[PDB]
Coordinates of C-alpha atoms and ligand atoms in Angstrom, one line a residue:
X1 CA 139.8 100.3 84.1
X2 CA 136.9 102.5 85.4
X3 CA 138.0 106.3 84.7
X4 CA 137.2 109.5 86.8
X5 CA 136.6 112.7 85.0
X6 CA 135.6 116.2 86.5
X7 CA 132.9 117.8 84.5
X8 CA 133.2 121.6 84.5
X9 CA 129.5 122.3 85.6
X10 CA 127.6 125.5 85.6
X11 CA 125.6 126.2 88.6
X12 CA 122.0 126.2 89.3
X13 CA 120.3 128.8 92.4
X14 CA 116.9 127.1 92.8
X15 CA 118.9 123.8 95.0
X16 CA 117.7 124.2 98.8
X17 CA 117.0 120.9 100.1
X18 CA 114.5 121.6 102.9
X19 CA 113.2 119.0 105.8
X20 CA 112.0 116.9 103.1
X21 CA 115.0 117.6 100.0
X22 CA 114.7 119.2 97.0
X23 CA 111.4 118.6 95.2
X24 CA 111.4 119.5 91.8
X25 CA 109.3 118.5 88.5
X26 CA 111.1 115.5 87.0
X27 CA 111.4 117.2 83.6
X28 CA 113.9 119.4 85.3
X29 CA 116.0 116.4 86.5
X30 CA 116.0 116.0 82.8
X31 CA 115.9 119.1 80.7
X32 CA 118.3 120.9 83.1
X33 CA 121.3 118.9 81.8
X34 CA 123.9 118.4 85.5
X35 CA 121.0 119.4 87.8
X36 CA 120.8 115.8 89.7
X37 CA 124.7 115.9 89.5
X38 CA 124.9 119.3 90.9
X39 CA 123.4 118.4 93.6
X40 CA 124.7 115.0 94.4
X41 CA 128.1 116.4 94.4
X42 CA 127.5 119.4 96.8
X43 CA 126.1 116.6 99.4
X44 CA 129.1 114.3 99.0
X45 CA 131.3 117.5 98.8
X46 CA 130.0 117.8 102.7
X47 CA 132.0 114.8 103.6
X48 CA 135.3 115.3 104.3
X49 CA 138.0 114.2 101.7
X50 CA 139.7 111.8 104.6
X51 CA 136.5 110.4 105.8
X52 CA 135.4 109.2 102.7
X53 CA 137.3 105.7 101.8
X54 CA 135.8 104.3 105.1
X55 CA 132.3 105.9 104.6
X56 CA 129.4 104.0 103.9
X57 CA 126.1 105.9 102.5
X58 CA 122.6 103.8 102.2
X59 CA 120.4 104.2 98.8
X60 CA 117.2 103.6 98.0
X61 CA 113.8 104.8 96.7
X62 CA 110.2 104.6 96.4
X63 CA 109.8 103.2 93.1
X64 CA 108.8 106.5 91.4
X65 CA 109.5 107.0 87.4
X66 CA 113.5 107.8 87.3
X67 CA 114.4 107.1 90.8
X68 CA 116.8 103.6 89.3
X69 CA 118.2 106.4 86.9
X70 CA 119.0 108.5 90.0
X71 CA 120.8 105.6 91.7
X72 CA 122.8 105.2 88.9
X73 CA 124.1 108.6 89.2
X74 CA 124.6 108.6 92.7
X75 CA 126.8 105.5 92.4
X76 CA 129.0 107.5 89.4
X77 CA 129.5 110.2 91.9
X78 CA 130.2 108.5 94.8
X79 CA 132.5 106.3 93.6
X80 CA 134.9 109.1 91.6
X81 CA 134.4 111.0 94.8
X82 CA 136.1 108.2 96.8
X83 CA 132.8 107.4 98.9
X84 CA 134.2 103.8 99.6
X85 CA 131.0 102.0 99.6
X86 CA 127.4 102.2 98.9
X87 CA 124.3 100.2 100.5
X88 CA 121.4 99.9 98.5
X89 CA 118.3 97.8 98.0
X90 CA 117.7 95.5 95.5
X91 CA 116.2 97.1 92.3
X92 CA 117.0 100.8 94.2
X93 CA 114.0 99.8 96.2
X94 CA 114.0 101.4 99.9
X95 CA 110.9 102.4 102.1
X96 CA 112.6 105.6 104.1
X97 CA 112.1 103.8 107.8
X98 CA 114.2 101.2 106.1
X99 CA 117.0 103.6 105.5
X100 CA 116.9 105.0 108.4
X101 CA 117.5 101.4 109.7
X102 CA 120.1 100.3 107.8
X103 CA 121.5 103.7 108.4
X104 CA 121.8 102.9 112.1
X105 CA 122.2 99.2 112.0
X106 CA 125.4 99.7 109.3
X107 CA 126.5 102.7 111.2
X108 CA 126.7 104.2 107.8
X109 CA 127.9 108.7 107.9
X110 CA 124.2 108.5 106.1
X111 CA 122.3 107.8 103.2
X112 CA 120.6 109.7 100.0
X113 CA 116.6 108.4 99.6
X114 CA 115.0 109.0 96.2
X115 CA 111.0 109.8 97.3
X116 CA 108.8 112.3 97.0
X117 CA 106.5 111.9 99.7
X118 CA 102.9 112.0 98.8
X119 CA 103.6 113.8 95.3
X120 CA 102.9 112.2 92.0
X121 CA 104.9 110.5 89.7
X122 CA 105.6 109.1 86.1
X123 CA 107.5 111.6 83.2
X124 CA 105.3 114.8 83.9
X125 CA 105.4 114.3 87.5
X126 CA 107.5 114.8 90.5
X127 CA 111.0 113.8 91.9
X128 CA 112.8 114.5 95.0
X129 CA 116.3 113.8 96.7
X130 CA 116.4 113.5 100.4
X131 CA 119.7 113.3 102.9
X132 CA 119.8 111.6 106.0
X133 CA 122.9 111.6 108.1
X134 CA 124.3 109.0 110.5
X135 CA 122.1 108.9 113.1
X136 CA 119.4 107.7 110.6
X137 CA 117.6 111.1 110.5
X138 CA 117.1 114.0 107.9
X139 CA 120.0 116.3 107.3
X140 CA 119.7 119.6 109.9
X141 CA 119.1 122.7 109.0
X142 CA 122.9 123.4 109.2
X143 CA 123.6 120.2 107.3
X144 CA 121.1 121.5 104.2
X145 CA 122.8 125.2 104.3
X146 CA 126.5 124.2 103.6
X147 CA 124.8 122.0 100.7
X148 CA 122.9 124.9 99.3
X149 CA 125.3 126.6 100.0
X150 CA 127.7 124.1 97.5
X151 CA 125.4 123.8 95.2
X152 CA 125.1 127.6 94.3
X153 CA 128.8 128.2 93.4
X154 CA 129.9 124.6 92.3
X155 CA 132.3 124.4 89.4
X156 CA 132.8 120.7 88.2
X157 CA 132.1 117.5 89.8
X158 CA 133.6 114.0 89.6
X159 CA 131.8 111.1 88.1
X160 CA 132.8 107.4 86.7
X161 CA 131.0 107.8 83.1
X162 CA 131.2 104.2 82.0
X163 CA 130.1 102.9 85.6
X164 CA 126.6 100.7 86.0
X165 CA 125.1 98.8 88.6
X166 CA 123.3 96.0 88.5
X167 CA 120.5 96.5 90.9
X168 CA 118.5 93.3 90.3
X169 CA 120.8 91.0 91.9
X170 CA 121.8 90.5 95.4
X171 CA 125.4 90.7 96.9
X172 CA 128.6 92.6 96.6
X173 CA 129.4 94.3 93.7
X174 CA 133.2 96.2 93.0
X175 CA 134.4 98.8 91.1
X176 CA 138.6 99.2 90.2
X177 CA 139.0 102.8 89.9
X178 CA 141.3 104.1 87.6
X179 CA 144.7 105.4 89.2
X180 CA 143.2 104.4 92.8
X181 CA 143.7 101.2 94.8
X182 CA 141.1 100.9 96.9
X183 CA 137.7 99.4 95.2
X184 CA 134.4 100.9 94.9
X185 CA 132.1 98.5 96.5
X186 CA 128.5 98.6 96.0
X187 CA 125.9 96.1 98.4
X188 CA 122.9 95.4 97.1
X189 CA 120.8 94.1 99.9
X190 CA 117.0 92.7 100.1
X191 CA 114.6 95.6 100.3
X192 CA 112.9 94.1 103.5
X193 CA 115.2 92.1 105.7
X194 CA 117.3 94.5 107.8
X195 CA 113.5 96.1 108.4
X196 CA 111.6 93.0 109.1
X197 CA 114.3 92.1 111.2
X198 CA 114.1 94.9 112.9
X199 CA 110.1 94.5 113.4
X200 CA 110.6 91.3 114.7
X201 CA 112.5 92.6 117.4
X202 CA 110.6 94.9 118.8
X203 CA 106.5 93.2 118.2
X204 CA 105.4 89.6 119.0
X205 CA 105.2 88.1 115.8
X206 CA 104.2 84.7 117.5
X207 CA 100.8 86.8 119.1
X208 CA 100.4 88.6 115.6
X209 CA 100.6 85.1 113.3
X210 CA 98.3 83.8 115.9
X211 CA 96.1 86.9 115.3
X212 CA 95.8 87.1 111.3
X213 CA 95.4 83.4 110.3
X214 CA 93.1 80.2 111.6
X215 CA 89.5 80.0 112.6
X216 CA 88.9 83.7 114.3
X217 CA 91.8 85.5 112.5
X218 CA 91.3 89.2 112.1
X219 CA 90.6 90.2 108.7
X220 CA 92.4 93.0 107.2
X221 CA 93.1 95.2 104.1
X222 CA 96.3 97.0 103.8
X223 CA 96.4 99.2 100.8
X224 CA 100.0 100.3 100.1
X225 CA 98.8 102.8 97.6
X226 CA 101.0 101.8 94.7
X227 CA 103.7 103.3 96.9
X228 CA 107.1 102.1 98.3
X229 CA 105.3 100.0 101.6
X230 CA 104.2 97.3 99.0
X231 CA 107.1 94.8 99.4
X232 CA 107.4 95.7 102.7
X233 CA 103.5 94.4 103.1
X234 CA 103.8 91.2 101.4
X235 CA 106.7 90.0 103.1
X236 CA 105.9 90.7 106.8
X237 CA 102.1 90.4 107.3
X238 CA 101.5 88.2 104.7
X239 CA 104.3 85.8 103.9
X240 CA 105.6 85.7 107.4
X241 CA 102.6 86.7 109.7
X242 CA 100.0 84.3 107.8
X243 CA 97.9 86.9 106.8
X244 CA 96.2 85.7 103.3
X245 CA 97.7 87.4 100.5
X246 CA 94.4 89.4 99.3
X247 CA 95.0 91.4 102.6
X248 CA 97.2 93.2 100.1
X249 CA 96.2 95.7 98.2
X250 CA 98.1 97.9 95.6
X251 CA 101.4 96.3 97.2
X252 CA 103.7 96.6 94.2
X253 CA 104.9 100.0 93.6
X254 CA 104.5 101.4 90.4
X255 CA 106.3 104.3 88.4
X256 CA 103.9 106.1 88.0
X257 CA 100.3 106.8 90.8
X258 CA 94.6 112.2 103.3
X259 CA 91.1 111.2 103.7
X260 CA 90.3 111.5 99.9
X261 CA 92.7 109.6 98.9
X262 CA 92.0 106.2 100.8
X263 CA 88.7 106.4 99.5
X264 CA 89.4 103.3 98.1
X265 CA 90.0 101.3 101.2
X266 CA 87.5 103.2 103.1
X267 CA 84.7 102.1 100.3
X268 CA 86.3 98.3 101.1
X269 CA 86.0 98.5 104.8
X270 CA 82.9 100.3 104.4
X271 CA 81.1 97.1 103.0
X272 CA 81.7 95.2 106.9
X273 CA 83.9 92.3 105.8
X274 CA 86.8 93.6 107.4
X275 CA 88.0 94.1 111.4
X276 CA 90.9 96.0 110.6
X277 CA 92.2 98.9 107.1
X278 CA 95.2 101.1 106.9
X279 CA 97.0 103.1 104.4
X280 CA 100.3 104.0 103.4
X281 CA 101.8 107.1 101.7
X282 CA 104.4 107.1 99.3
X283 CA 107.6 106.3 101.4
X284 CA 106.5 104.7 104.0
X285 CA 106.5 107.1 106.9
X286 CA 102.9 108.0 107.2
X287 CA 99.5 105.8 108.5
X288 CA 95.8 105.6 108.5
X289 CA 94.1 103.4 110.8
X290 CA 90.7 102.5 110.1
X291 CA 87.9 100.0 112.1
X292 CA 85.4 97.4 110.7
X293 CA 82.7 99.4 109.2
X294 CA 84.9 101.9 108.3
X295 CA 85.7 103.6 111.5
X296 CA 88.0 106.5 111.4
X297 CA 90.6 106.6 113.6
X298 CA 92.2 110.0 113.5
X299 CA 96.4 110.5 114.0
X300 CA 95.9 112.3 116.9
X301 CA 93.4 109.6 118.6
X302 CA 95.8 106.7 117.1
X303 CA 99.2 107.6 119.0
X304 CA 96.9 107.9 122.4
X305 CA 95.0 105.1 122.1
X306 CA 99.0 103.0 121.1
X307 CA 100.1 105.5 124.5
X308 CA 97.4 103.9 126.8
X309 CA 98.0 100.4 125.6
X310 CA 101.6 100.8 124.9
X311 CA 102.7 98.0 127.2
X312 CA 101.3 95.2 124.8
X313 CA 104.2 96.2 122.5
X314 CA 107.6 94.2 123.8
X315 CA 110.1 96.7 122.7
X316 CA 108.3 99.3 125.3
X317 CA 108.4 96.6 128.1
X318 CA 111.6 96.1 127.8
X319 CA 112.9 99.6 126.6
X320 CA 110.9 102.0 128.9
X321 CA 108.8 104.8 127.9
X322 CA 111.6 107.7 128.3
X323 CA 108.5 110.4 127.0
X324 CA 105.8 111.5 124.7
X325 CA 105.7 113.9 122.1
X326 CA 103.4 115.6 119.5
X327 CA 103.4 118.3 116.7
X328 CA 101.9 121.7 118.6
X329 CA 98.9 121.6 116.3
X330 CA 98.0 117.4 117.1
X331 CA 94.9 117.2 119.7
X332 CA 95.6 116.6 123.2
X333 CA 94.3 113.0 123.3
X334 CA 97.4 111.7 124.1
X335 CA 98.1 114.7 126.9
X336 CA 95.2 112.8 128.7
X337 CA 97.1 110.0 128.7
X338 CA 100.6 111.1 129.4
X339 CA 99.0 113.2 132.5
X340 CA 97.4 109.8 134.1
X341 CA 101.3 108.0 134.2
X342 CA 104.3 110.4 135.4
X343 CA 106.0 110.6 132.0
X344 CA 106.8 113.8 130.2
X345 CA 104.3 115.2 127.3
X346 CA 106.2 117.6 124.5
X347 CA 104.5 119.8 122.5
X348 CA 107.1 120.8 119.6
X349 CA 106.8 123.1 116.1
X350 CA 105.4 120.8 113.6
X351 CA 108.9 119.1 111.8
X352 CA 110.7 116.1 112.5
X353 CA 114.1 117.3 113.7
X354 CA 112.2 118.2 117.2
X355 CA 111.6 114.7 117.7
X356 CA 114.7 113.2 117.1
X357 CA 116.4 115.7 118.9
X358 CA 114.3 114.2 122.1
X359 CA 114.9 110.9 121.1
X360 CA 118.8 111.4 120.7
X361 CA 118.5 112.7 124.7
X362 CA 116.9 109.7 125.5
X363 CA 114.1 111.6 126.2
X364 CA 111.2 110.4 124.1
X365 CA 110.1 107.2 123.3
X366 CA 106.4 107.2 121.5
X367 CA 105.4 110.5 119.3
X368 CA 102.8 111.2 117.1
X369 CA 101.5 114.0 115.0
X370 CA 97.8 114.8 113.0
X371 CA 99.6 114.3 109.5
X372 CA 99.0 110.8 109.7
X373 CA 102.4 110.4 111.3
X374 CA 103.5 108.0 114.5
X375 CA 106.7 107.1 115.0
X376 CA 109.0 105.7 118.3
X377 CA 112.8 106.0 119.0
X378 CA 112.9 102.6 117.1
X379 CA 114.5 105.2 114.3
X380 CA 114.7 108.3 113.2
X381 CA 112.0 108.6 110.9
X382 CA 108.0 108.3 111.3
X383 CA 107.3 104.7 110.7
X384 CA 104.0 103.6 108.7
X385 CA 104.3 100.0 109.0
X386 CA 105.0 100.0 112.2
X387 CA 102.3 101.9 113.3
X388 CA 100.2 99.2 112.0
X389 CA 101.9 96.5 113.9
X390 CA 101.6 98.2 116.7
X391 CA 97.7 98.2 116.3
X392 CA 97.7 94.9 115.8
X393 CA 99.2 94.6 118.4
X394 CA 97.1 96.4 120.9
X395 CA 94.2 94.3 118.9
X396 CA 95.8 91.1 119.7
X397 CA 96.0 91.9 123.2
X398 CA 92.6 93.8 123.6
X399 CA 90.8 91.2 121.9
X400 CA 88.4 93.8 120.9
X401 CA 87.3 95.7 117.8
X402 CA 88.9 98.6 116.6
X403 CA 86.2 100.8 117.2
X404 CA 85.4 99.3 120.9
X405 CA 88.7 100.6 121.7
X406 CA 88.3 103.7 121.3
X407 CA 85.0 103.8 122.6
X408 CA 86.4 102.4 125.8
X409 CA 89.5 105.0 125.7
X410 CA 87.1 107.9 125.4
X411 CA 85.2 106.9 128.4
X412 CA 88.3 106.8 130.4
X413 CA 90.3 109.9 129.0
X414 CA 87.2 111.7 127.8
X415 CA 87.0 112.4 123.9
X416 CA 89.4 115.0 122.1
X417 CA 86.7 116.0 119.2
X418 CA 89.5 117.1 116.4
X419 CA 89.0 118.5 112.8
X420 CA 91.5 119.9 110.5
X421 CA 90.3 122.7 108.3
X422 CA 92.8 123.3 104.9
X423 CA 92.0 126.5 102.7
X424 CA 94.6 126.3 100.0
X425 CA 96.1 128.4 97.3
X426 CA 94.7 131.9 99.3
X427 CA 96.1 135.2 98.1
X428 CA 98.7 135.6 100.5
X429 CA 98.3 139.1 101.0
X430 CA 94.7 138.6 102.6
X431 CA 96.0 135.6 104.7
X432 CA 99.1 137.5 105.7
X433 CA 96.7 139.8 106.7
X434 CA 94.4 137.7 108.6
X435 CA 97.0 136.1 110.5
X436 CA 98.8 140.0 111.4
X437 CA 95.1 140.8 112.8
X438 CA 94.4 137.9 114.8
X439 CA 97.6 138.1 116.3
X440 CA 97.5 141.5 117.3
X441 CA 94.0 141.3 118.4
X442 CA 95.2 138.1 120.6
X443 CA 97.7 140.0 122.0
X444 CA 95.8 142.8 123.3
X445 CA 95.8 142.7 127.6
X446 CA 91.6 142.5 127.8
X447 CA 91.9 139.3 125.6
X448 CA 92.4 136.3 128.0
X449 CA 89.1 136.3 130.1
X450 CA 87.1 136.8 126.8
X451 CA 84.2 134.4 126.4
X452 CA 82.5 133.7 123.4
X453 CA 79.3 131.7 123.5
X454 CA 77.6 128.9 121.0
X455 CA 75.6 129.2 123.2
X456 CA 74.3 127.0 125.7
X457 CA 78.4 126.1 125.7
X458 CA 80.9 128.3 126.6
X459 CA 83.9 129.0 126.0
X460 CA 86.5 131.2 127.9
X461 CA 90.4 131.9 127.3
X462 CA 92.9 130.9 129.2
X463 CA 95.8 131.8 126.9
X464 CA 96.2 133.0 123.4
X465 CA 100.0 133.4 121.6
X466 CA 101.9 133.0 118.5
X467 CA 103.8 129.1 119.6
X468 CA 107.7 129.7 120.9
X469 CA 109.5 126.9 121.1
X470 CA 113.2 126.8 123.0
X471 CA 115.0 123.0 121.6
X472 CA 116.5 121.5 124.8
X473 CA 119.3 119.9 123.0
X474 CA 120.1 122.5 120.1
X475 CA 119.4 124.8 121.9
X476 CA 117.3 126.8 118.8
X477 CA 114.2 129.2 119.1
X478 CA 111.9 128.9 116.8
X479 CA 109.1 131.7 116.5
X480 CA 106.0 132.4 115.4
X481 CA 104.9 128.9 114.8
X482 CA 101.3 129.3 114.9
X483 CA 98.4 131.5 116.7
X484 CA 97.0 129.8 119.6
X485 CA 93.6 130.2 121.3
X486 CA 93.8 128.4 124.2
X487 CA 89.8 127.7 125.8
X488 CA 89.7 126.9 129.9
X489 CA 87.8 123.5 129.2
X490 CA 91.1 122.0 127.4
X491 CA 89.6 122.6 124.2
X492 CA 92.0 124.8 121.4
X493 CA 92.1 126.7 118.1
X494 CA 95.1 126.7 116.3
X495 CA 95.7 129.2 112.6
X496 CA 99.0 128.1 110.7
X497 CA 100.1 129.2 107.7
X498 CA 102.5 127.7 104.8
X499 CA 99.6 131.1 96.2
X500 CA 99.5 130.2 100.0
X501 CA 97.4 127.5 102.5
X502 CA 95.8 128.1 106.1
X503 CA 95.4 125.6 108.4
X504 CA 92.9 125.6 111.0
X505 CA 92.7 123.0 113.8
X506 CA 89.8 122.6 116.1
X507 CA 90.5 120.7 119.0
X508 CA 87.2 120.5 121.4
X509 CA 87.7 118.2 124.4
X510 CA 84.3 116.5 125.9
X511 CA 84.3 114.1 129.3
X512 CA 80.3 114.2 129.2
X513 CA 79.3 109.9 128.4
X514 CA 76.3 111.4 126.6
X515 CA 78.5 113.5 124.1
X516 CA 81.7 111.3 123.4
X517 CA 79.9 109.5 120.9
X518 CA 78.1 112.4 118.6
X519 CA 79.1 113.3 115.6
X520 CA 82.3 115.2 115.5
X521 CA 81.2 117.9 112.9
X522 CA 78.6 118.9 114.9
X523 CA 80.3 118.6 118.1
X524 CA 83.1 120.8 116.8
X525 CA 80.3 123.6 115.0
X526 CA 80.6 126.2 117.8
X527 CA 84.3 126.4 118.2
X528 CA 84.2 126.5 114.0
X529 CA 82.1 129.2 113.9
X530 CA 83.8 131.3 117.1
X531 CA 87.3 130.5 114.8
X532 CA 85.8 132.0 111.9
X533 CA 84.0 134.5 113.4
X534 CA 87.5 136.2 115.5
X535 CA 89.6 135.4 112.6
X536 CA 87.7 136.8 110.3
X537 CA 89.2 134.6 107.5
X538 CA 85.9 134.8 104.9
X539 CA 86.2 138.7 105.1
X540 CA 90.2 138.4 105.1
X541 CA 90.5 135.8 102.1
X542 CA 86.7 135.3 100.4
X543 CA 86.2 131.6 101.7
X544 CA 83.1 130.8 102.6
X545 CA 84.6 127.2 102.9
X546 CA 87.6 125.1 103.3
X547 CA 89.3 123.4 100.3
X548 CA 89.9 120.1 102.4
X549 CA 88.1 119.0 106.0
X550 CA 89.8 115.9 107.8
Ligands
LIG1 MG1 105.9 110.4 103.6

């Protein structure tokens, strides 16, 4: 039956997987002829030989143009390289907290995930292929060398050439391999059980089907975005939490497409029908909250205000809270909270592999990031959908509006005004430049103690470095993660950089009753103009604005 042949293959250089995978234009998964293969081989060619049989790896994708293509040839490879069985979700369909679910759940050595992330997608679009490894988490930076590593000097791979799978229907499909005697056996589960299962475990979906339907149910609008969170939607707060079904929005995900870009959903909420919005992105592992009205809830504001109320949520009462965590450059909203209970607050490199690293110790429970990203020790990926449930959540409990919440969490913690300011595609030379300036300016001995006026406020500093972070479990330094400016008043400005794009957060932190509830942009104007004004960034790169302002 089913033959294995090894295709002599010539190498590509271009194949380093990242945090994320390798990204790449999707007509180069199909003009370079063996580029997907290539690289699927140099990740299976990480397992060893005598683990294989008994291995497991999850697959699945967000919909996107070619990802069911891409299955297919992950299944080819796998099975000629003697990976004993696949896991994937019916019609290749997989939101990436679901893999790294049925990663854990399985106790699969890992799975490959077919997403892009936020990018675009049809034929003249983008495709990407992402590695997670058994503990339901992206592939380490030493995991992603030895495959770029592969991938540069492969020769020939193994593939079954007449091999298909039928990924419409559900159950247990095998494979006889030609001249072996164990089968290839390929799973194709429901997209959304082992998740919703999962979801139902840790929330109080008898409080949350009270909340969405009957007389006084809260009204919501949950736009998936055409993405991979679409199923995921339907199935859980509709079909099983009673929320009506035109709750839904943009819930099927197609093949083919920050705060721009739910300007759809904001325009809904906008009109005052509904208590409650959110968005997804494309795989499922980023969140935007929104209020009746349209209320913004910002990422940084939304993991403090689920830290302050994180007792309504029934995995945390019965877990623990072991710790919280956020990204360097995230507001300290939730360090207010963490400070008023006696569990640990980490500030880490922006990344995900920090985080799970803390989780792994049993050292972090509830962490949170300004990329629209929250996430628990539930898995090992940030988790959209459950961000949203855990909202609800708080909502049920609260029994107020979104809005009153937060109002109510300022006046206790005080308000962490926060902007993010994006110039992209800058000459790198000029940024490069600008950063080599500030830092060396920052550095100088007569710098902390400097105070710089709006006036009326003032401003003095307290500390000022390029953010060093030791890892407690790897044990890893990682340097020069971004220039610090740190203000006496707990307020911060933050330069990152990544042609090229500078970041610039403004984090301005206000107790005063008669200032929580101004306008942010003009609450955050002197510490704006004091960044602009030390960085020099129009003289160092010709803005006179940024490209993006969340
Ligand atoms: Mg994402």
């Amino acid at each position: 039956m089913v033959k294995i042949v090894t295709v002599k293959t010539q190498a590509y250089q271009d194949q380093k997987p990242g945090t994320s995978g390798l990204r790449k234009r999707v007509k180069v998964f199909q003009s370079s002829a063996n580029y997907a293969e290539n690289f699927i081989q140099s990740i299976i060619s990480t397992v060893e030989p005598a683990q294989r049989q008994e291995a497991t790896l999850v697959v699945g994708g967000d919909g996107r143009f070619y990802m069911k293509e891409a299955i297919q040839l992950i299944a080819r490879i796998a099975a000629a390289n003697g990976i004993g069985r696949l896991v994937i979700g019916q019609n290749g369909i997989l939101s990436t907290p679901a893999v790294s679910c049925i990663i854990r759940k399985i106790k699969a050595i890992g799975g490959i995930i077919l997403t892009a992330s936020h990018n675009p997608r049809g034929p003249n679009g983008d495709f990407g292929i992402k590695f997670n490894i058994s503990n339901g988490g992206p592939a380490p930076e030493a995991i992603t060398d030895k495959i770029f590593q592969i991938s540069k000097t492969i020769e020939e791979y193994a593939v079954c050439p007449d091999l298909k799978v039928d990924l419409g229907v559900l159950g247990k499909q095998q494979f006889d391999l030609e001249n072996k005697f164990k089968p290839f056996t390929v799973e194709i589960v429901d997209s959304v059980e082992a998740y919703a299962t999962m979801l139902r475990s840790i929330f109080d979906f008898s409080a949350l089907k009270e909340l969405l339907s009957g007389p006084n149910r809260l009204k919501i609008r949950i736009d998936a975005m055409h993405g991979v969170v679409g199923p995921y939607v339907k199935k859980i707060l509709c079909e099983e939490l009673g929320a009506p079904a035109n709750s839904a929005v943009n819930c099927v995900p197609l093949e083919d497409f920050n705060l721009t870009y739910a300007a759809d959903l904001v325009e809904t909420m906008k009109s005052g029908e509904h208590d409650f919005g959110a968005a997804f992105d494309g795989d499922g592992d980023r969140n935007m909250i929104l209020g009746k009205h349209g209320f913004f809830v910002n990422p940084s504001d939304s993991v403090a205000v689920i830290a302050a109320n994180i007792f309504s949520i029934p995995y945390f009462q019965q877990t623990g809270v072991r710790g919280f965590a956020r990204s360097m450059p995230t507001s300290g909203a939730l360090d207010r909270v963490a400070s008023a209970t006696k569990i640990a607050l980490y500030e880490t490199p922006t990344g995900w592999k920090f985080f799970g690293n803390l989780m792994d110790a049993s050292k972090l429970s509830l962490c949170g990031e300004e990329s629209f990203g929250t996430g628990s020790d539930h898995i090992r990926e940030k988790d959209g959908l459950w961000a949203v449930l855990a909202w609800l959540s708080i909502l049920a409990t609260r029994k107020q509006s979104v809005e009153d919440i937060l109002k109510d969490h300022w006046q206790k913690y005080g308000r962490n005004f926060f902007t993010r300011y994006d110039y992209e595609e800058v000459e790198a030379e000029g940024a490069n430049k600008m950063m080599k300036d500030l830092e060396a300016l920052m550095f100088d001995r007569s710098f902390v103690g400097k105070q710089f006026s709006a006036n009326d406020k003032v401003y003095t500093v307290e500390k000022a470095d390029n953010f060093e972070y030791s890892d407690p479990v790897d044990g890893s330094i990682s340097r020069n993660q971004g220039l610090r400016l740190i203000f006496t008043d707990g307020s911060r400005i933050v330069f990152r950089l990544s042609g090229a794009t500078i970041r610039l957060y403004i984090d301005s932190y206000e107790k005063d009753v008669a200032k929580i509830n101004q306008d942010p942009q003009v609450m955050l104007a002197p510490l704006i103009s004091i960044a602009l004004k030390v960085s020099q960034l129009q003289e160092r790169t010709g803005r006179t604005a940024p490209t993006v302002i969340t």
